[PDB]
Amino acid sequence: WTATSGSCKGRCFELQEVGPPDCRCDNLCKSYSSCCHDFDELCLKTARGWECTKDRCGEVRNEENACHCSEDCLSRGDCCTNYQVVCKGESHWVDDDCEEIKVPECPAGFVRPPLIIFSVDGFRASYMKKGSKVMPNIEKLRSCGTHAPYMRPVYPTKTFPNLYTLATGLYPESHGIVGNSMYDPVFDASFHLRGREKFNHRWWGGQPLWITATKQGVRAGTFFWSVSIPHERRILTILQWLSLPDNERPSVYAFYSEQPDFSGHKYGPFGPEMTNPLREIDKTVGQLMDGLKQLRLHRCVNVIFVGDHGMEDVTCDRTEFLSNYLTNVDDITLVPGTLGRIRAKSINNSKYDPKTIIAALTCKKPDQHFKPYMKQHLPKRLHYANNRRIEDIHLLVDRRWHVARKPLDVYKKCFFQGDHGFDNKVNSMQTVFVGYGPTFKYRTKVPPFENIELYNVMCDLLGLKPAPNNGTHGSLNHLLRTNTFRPTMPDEVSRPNYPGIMYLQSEFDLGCTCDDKVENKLEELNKRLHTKGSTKERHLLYGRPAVLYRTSYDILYHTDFESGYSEIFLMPLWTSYTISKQAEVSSIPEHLTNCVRPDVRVSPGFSQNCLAYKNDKQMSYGFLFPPYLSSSPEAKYDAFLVTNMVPMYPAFKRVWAYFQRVLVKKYASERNGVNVISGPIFDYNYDGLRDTEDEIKQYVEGSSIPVPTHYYSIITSCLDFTQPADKCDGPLSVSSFILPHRPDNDESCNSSEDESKWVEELMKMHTARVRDIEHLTGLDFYRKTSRSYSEILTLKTYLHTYESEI
Ligand SMILES: *[C@@H]1O[C@H](CO)[C@@H](O[C@@H]2O[C@H](CO)[C@@H](O[C@@H]3O[C@H](CO[C@H]4O[C@H](CO)[C@@H](O)[C@H](O[C@H]5O[C@H](CO)[C@@H](O)[C@H](O)[C@@H]5O[C@H]5O[C@H](CO)[C@@H](O)[C@H](O)[C@@H]5O)[C@@H]4O)[C@@H](O)[C@H](O[C@H]4O[C@H](CO)[C@@H](O)[C@H](O)[C@@H]4O[C@H]4O[C@H](CO)[C@@H](O)[C@H](O)[C@@H]4O)[C@@H]3O)[C@H](O)[C@H]2NC(C)=O)[C@H](O)[C@H]1NC(C)=O
Ligand SMILES: C=C(C(=O)C[C@@H](C)[C@H]1CC[C@@]2(C)[C@@H]3CC[C@H]4[C@H](C(=O)O)[C@H](O)C[C@H](O)[C@@]45C[C@@]35CC[C@]12C)C(C)C
Ligand SMILES: [Ca+2]
Ligand code: NA
Ligand code: NA
Ligand SMILES: [Zn+2]
């Protein structure tokens, strides 16, 4: 109930939302069906429209008017935004040359530059350039401020997940808004765009910017606007709040536009009808900036112009139907569209089996335009698994397509030409970022980055301490003139042992064999030097990764590679080696095919054993440093050490061997040498974080050899590729992957073909940020470079996406 009997007189667009049943006068009251009876009359005036005219200049104040053209209007703070242009011979903000804002130029009583977030729904990255002709205010912000060529949204690329990621710096799996539609099995409640459940606070996790601000004594505007409030009124209301006395004035504001998304759905991202929506958004930006200039705030406020996701061509006829694959279609509930989430229609149906569903949706049609996954097998870069609101079964849909349950869902439930929601590395899903103001840099282009990072920066812009979040604070310091955050490297927690030769061959009862018995102070002193780390500066180029949790591990040096070998997990945490552009690939020799050699530095009791592999009929093994890339026949023996071995399913070995034999050398040819760091990952609870020893669900049969869920590699080279990776003067270039360690290649429909037709495609899908590998391993890389730490933080958040140019 709401006793809407109170009055909004003197309360229009109040910031403090008042409690039931007292009627509300804030920008969300309409949405809660809760506004006082006179809210429209007093708060949403429209008379005479939104622009001053010559005949209105110096008029007598008429309180009925939407905005004012009278002489008192500037002090009152309620002029039309074009008032000084029409009445005082001033220029529009867009028509002024840009001039660098070296310091804030704010009126007295401003304690810090305000922040205004201007968020546009469905604003595809390529609109900045393709629409630049019809967007002159936006184009001036972009070209005069700091911009990225694009900004990467989170998966799924839908409105609510992304708008709440912007506000919190969290992945959807962490903030809990995992789609526009959700079922929470614990609450037994459903969340939908239309309905009352979405208003319930229990859905919304983490700590959004407005709560962060409020809790730290920084006043916030109310971020969101009921759909019926026209954009011109939203702008005028922001400009009003900015004219409030110092003790009442908010320090952060948001404007939100439903466009161009709304038109994009109807017309496609580039439908000819899309020009007018882009003009309209630009006019709105122009009104803000003229209004700011009027208040002498246009060289004082920081403005972020930011989108939530882009828009793709999607029509009705490009729909896959689950009824075409499954006999049992009415036994499931599907959350459909540009992603699929499947669960049992009924909890009482014990004939429901996810395995049989996955199988029936796996590579069944030539051009099948979706791919099923259990959620833990989704690419780790998506960070889309650790929430009970995300169903176990997921359909990753091809761009341009939809999945649906049955044809009747699609013609009896076409209109649309655009949609979004797809994999967040798809070029059409990319969105925009522009920062303009005293705190941002001047005419600066910054590389693409992810929207998870912005929360930290908005906290920085406001002098707030950010809540714990998934950004990497400092990785966007290069966007900023001032207010940078100077993080320090985490302290290493465990220090390594450096074991020498401590064990005789006969102490090992591992069931391994090696034709290595075939046998000089020249090279014998030389190879002892190699075991002491004499070639380490070649193979460990950025220092050793720091271990950020308590554990017991050994650094092992070899001619061709260095490693940090875990005595707990019985295998390396990391293996680091450099391959020059001129390195040669050799074969595994015949007499070494099945060779595994004990490592005299590491006890039997801390080693793997070959018997365990012989007796495990599902498990084989691979090597982290590839034997194919030994520097010499003699050095090749090091690669067959039991301490270089890791468990690998035969299906996975096909992937790994092709990577090691073919791709590494190829990368070295293309990048002028590469430094590779490889290693296992264990994430049995799919939370994106390194498992402790007690969390491992699977071991090599009869042993304590834990089976990795994933294998990573971090491949680093010189950004300036005319310098060799090992002698690089400047910035680095990286790409990385996290490959799921799976006993089949069902993910790859083409896998019965030669690896050259499917392995690289698999690896591209499982591309990763170094930061992702860090969360998953508790390692910190790039500890010793010549580079600034913020620059290394940026490198660590880099994702190599393999998409062609935006
Ligand atoms: C991205 O950034 C975020 C934030 O930095 C990272 O997420 C954090 O990860 C931490 C480790 O997983 C986690 O710490 C846990 O917190 C528990 C208390 O949490 C409550 O309070 C906080 C703080 O205000 C609040 O934010 C939480 O909100 C979550 O939960 C509600 C659920 O309704 C949601 O509304 C909300 O969206 C959020 O959900 C998300 O997180 C939870 C986990 O908390 C997931 O389950 C959800 O799916 C969703 O992803 C909470 O309200 C605390 O109880 C935990 O402590 C247990 O575990 C530790 C391990 O060290 C152990 O020492 C403790 O003793 C304790 O164990 C006991 O409970 C066990 C399980 O019940 C049991 O097995 C034991 O026997 C013990 O009895 C834990 O410390 C932190 O909460 C989240 N924060 C957020 C905001 O999500 C995230 O990791 C980052 N991602 C990446 C890839 O880096
Ligand atoms: C849980 C908290 C919240 O604030 C919860 C808070 C984040 C939630 C509660 C209400 C909510 C679901 C609104 C619903 C109506 C919608 C509008 C409309 O449909 O008329 C509009 O079209 C776009 C938009 O999607 C919109 C405004 C929102 C967005 C998010 C909101 C504000 C704490 C953290 C304070
Ligand atoms: Ca884990
Ligand atoms: Na085996
Ligand atoms: Na296959
Ligand atoms: Zn949309």
- To test the pocket of ligand 1, the residue of 154, 155, 168, 174 to mutate (highest count of ligand atoms within 8 Å of its CB) is 174
609 is in an annotated binding site: no
> Is the dihedral angle over the CA atoms 11, 17, 19, 21 positive or is it negative?
positive
Pairing mode, if any, of strands 115-121 and 252-260? parallel
773 alpha carbon to ligand 1 midpoint, in Å?
20
Q: DSSP code of 191?
A: E
| Alpha-carbon span 781 to 795, nearest angstrom | 11
Q: Are the beta carbons of 74 and 294 closer than 8 angstroms?
A: yes
* Phi-psi map region of 122: left, alpha, beta (phi>0 left; psi -120 to 50 alpha): left
**Residue 645: φ, ψ to 5°:** -85, 145
Ion ligand 3 neighbours (CB, 5 A) are 683, 685, 687, 689, 691
User: Can you give the length of the chain in residues?
Assistant: 806
Listed residue (405, 378, 408, 381) closest to 391, CA to CA: 378
With beta carbons less than 8 A apart as the criterion, state whether 683 and 695 touch.
no
Strand partners, 699: 706
State the distance from the centre of ligand 6 to the C-alpha of 311, rounded, in angstroms. Answer: 8
What is the H or E stretch that residue 770 is in? helix 770-777
Residues touching ligand 1 (Cβ under 6 Å) are: 170-171, 173-176, 205-206, 383, 386-387, 468-470, 687-689, 775
CA-closest residue to ligand 2 atom 23? 227
Token digits of residue 40? 């429209």
How many whole angstroms separate alpha carbon 675 and alpha carbon 714?
8
CA angle 244, 249, 254 (to 5 degrees): 110
Q: How open is the CA angle 565-567-568, to the nearest 5 degrees? A: 120
198 Cβ inside 6 Å of ligand 2:
yes
Q: Are 726 and 580 a contacting pair, CB within 8 Å?
A: yes
Q: Give the distance (Å) from ligand 3 centre to CA of residue 429.
A: 29
Contacts 24+ apart (CB under 8 A), 684-687: 684/709, 685/386, 686/375, 686/376, 686/385, 686/386, 687/385, 687/386
> Residue 261, annotated ligand binder?
yes
DSSP 620-656: EEEESS-GGG-SSHHHHGGGGBGGGEEEE-HHHHHHH
Phi, psi angle pair for 197, to nearest 5°? -60, -40
By CB neighbour count within 10 A (0-12 exposed, 13-18 middle, 19+ buried), where does 42 fall? middle
Rounded distance, CA 623 to CA 645, Å? 5
Report yes or no: 336 and 435 within 8 Å, Cβ to Cβ: no
- Strand order of the sheet with strand 553-557? 553-557, 562-566, 571-579, 674-681, 710-718, 732-740, 767-768
Rama region for 408: left / alpha / beta (φ>0; ψ in -120 to 50; rest): alpha
Neighbours of ion ligand 6 (CB under 5 A): 261
Question: 259 by DSSP, 3-state: which?
Answer: strand
For residue 685, say whether it is annotated as part of any ligand binding site. yes
* 688 Cα–ligand 1 center, Å: 13
Reading across the β-sheet that carries 115-121, which strands appear in turn? Answer: 252-260, 115-121, 302-307, 433-436, 146-147, 444-445
* Angstrom resolution of this structure: 2.0
Are the C-beta atoms of 202 and 364 separated by less than 8 Å?
Answer: no
Nearest CA to ligand 2 atom 6: 199
Token reading at 574:
């990391």
From the number of C-beta atoms within 10 Å of its C-beta (0-12, 13-18, 19+), residue 47 rates as exposed
The tokens for 481 are 């003139």
Non-local (6+) Cβ contacts of 539 within 8 A are 560, 561, 562, 576, 577, 578, 675
Q: Find out whether 594 and 640 touch, Cβ atoms under 8 Å.
A: no
Task: Respond yes or no on whether the N-terminal peptide bond of residue 466 is cis (omega within 30° of 0).
Answer: no
Catalytic residue, candidates 81, 146, 159, 168: 159
Q: After which residues is the chain broken (C to N over 2.5 A)?
A: 413, 519
Look at residues 776, 777, 774, 779 and name the one whose alpha carbon lies nearest to residue 798: 774
Strands 546-547 and 779-780: antiparallel
Strand order in the sheet with 339-344: 332-335, 339-344, 393-397, 370-374
User: Are the C-beta atoms of residues 378 and 396 closer than 8 Å to each other?
Assistant: yes
Which residue from 438, 428, 470, 477 is spatially nearest to 452, judged by alpha carbons?
470
Q: Which token pair is 523?
A: 């090279």
Q: Which tokens sit at 805?
A: 């140019």
Report which ligand 2 atom has the smallest distance to the Cα of 207.
34
List the one residue out of 791, 14, 104, 26 whose CA is nearest residue 463: 104
Which residues, in sequence order, are CB contacts of 210 under 8 Å at separation 6+? 167, 220, 221, 222, 223, 252
Query: In DSSP terms, which residues pair with 715 in a beta bridge?
Result: 676, 735
DSSP state letters, 707-751 = PPSEEEEEEEEESSTTS-GGG--S-EEEEEEEEE--SS-TT-TTT
Distance CA 15, CA 654 (A): 61
By C-alpha distance, which of 275, 338, 295, 317 is closest to 132? 275
**What's the CA gap between 637 and 244, in Å, rounded?**
76
CB atoms near residue 636 (< 10 Å): 21
Confirm or reject: Cβ of 204 under 6 Å from ligand 2.
yes
CA of 613 to the centre of ligand 4 (A): 4
302-307 vs 115-121, strand pairing mode: parallel
> Which letter does DSSP use for residue 220 in this model?
B
Strands 546-547 and 189-191 turn out to be unpaired
The tally of CA atoms less than 13 A away on the side-chain side of residue 469 is 30
Sign of the Cα pseudo-torsion (177, 182, 183, 187, in order): positive
- Pocket probe for ligand 2: among 24, 30, 31, 262, the residue whose CB has the most ligand atoms within 8 Å is 31
Cα(686) to centroid(ligand 3), Å: 5
Structure-block tokens of residue 36: 């006082």
Tell the residue number behind the tokens 């606070």, with chain if given: 201
Active-site residue flag, 431: no
Contacts (Cβ under 8 Å, ≥6 apart) of 662: 755, 756
Q: Give Cα separations from 105 to 141, 185, 441 (angstroms).
A: 17, 52, 15
Distance from residue 624's CA to the centre of ligand 3 (Å): 22
Question: What's the CA gap between 769 and 285, in Å, rounded?
Answer: 34
Query: Nearest to residue 343, comparing CAs of 497, 181, 227?
Result: 181
Q: What are phi and psi of 791, to 5 degrees?
A: -65, -35
Nearest-CA residue for ligand 2 atom 29 is: 224
Q: Is the peptide bond before 230 cis (omega within 30 degrees of 0)?
A: no
Distance CA 297, CA 64 (A): 27
Residue that has been written with the tokens 């459903």 in this structure: 190
On the 0-12 / 13-18 / 19+ scale of CB atoms within 10 A, 112 is middle
Look at ligand 2, atom 30, and give the residue with the nearest C-alpha: 224
Other beta carbons within 10 angstroms of residue 252's beta carbon come to: 23
How many CB atoms sit inside 10 A of residue 709's CB?
24
Strands 620-623 and 645-648: antiparallel
**Residue 75 burial (CB < 10 Å; 0-12/13-18/19+)?**
exposed
307: phi then psi, degrees, rounded to nearest 5: -110, 165
**For ion ligand 5, residues whose CB falls within 5 Å:** 745, 748, 751
Query: In the chain, what's the furthest Cα-to-Cα distance?
Result: 105
> Is 121 annotated as contributing to ligand binding?
yes
Find tokens 């700590």 and name the residue: 207
Alpha-helical regions (H) of 186-327: 209-214, 231-241, 261-267, 275-294
Ligand 2 atom closest to residue 203's alpha carbon, by position in its atom list: 1
The residue nearest atom 85 of ligand 1, judged by CA position, is: 174
Helices (H), 520-590: 521-531, 536-539
Q: Are 680 and 569 in contact (CB under 8 A)?
A: yes
Structure tokens at 156: 């799924």
Amino acid at the residue 1: W
Q: How far is the CA of 567 from the centre of ligand 1 (A)?
A: 29
Determine the Cα angle at 587 with ends 586 and 591, to 5°.
Answer: 130
Spell 337-370 as b/e; 16+ CB within 10 A means b: bbbbbbbbeeeeeeebeeeebbeebbeeeeebbb
C-beta separation of 561 from 767 below 8 A: no
Say how many CA atoms lie within 13 Å of 765 toward its Cβ. Answer: 15
Ligand 1 atom closest to residue 772's alpha carbon, by position in its atom list: 93
Nearest CA to ligand 2 atom 27: 224
Which backbone phi and psi does 43 adopt, to 5 degrees? Answer: -105, -30
Distances (CA, A) of 605 to 472, 495, 512, 619: 39, 21, 14, 21
Rg of the chain over Cα atoms, rounded to whole angstroms, equals: 30
Q: Which two tokens stand for residue 351?
A: 């004939």
Pairing between β-strand 339-344 and β-strand 393-397 as defined by DSSP bridges: antiparallel
φ, ψ for residue 681, nearest 5 deg: -125, 145
Q: Quick check: helix, strand or coil at residue 616? A: coil
Give the Å distance between the CA of 166 and the centre of ligand 2: 14
Residues 779 and 771: beta-carbon distance below 8 Å: no
Helix-helix angle 275-294:231-241, to 10 degrees: 20
Nearest ligand for residue 751 CA: 5
Q: Which pair of tokens denotes residue 686?
A: 């799919």
Identify the residue whose C-alpha is closest to ligand 1 atom 25: 206
**C-alpha–C-alpha distance, residues 348 and 222, integer Å:** 44
For 31-59, the DSSP string reads GGT-B-TTHHHHHS--BT-S---GGGTTP
Strand pairing report for 402-404 and 319-321: parallel
> Which residues have beta carbons under 5 A from ligand 4 (an ion)?
613, 616
Q: Class for domain 505-797, per CATH?
A: alpha beta
687 is in an annotated binding site: yes
Q: Are 705 and 605 in contact (CB under 8 A)?
A: no
Q: 509 — phi, psi (to 5°)? A: -115, 65
Do 389 and 775 meet the contact criterion of CB atoms below 8 Å apart?
A: no
Within 8 A by CB and 6+ apart from 362, the residues are 372, 746
Residue type, 558: H
Nearest atom (ligand 2) to Cα of 159: 25
Residue 489 · residue 780 · CB < 8 Å: yes
- 488 φ, ψ to 5°? -115, 150
172 close to 203: Cβ distance less than 8 angstroms: no
Instruction: Tell me the C-alpha to C-alpha distance, in Å, between residue 62 and each of 44, 46, 56, 67.
Output: 15, 12, 11, 9
For helices 454-461 and 159-168, angle between their N-to-C axes, nearest 10 degrees: 40
Helix (H) or strand (E) holding 393: strand 393-397
Question: Ligand 2 pocket check: which of 224, 262, 309 to mutate, most ligand atoms within 8 Å of Cβ?
Answer: 224
**3 state DSSP class of 597:** strand
Ligand nearest the Cα atom of residue 692:
3
Q: What separation in angstroms does the CA of 630 have from each of 22, 459, 580, 585, 627?
A: 77, 50, 12, 8, 6
- Contact in structure between 450 and 151 (CB atoms under 8 Å): yes
Neighbour tally for 746: CB within 10 Å: 17
Phi and psi angles of residue 51, each rounded to the nearest 5 degrees, phi first: -125, 140
Q: Give CA–CA dist 425/802, Å, rounded.
A: 9
Phi-psi region of 291 (alpha: psi -120 to 50; beta: other; left: phi over 0): alpha
Which two structure tokens, joined as six digits, stand for 223?
């971020």
- List beta partners, residue 344: 332
Distance CA(607)–CA(571), nearest Å, equals 8
How far apart are the C-alpha atoms of 178 and 170, rounded to whole Å?
A: 11
The DSSP output letter for 301 is: -
E strand or H helix at 775, and its extent?
A: helix 770-777
Which DSSP string do the residues of 117-179 spell out, in sequence order?
A: EEEEET-BTTHHHHTGGG-HHHHHHHHHSEE-S-EE-PSS--HHHHHHHHHH---HHHHS--S
Per DSSP, the three-state class of 271 is: coil
Q: Is the CB of 333 under 6 A from ligand 2?
A: no
The span from the CA of 171 to the CA of 249, in Å, is: 31
Look up residue 192 and give its two tokens: 């939908």
